[PDB]
Amino acid sequence: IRGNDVIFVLKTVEAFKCDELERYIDNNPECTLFESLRDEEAYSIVRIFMDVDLDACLDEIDYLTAIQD
Amino acid sequence: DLDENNFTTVPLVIDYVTPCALCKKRSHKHPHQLSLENGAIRIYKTGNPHSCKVKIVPLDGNKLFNIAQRILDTNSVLLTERGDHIV
Ligand SMILES: [Zn+2]
Questions:
Q1: Ligand 1 center to residue B7 CA distance, Å?
Q2: Which residue in B42, B46, B18 sits closest to B31, CA to CA?
Q3: Cβ of residue A59 closer than 8 Å to a chain B Cβ
Q4: Are B25 and B19 in contact (CB under 8 A)?
Q5: CA distance A64 to B27
Q6: What's the gap in Å between A13 CA and the centre of ligand 1?
Q7: Measured in angstroms, how far is the CA atom of residue A29 from the centroid of ligand 1?
Q8: Residue B62 — left, alpha, or beta (φ > 0 → left; ψ -120 to 50 → alpha)?
Q9: Cα torsion angle, B51, B39, A58, B47, sign
Q10: Largest CA distance in chain B
Q11: Rounded Cα gap, residues A25 and A34, in angstroms
Q12: For testing the chain A interface, which of B37, B41, B54, B57 should be mutated: the one with the most A CBs within 10 Å?
């Protein structure tokens, strides 16, 4: 694989590079793009990611210790 | 300077001989600070919060554990290389 430098996005589609995506984001701040996989079988190697949502507000100290743990 | 009644009031000032034991920084913007939360002492620097990671020290209790710790502090029980304790 040797890595991938192409990012496929869906508007609710495009295949942009790092500079291309940066320029498009700078031009359109309100555009809603979702990063996905252009081909599941070809480049299934991806990073490790997680999404966290807690409907409350925390101070700096509590957030720091909680994120460390 | 920090007593039993003023432990969290006076921020603790440290020396700069060695870098921070928590973040390896030579010098920090502000001195450290101690706070109490659920029977645990949190140690953290003021000013830049992300500069220093928060440390935690618990004051647990369990009288029998304290007694065991104190008896170990006197250094009366030892473990020989053969695996048998000497007192
Ligand atoms: Zn530090």
A1: 20
A2: B46
A3: no
A4: yes
A5: 21
A6: 46
A7: 37
A8: left
A9: negative
A10: 53
A11: 12
A12: B54
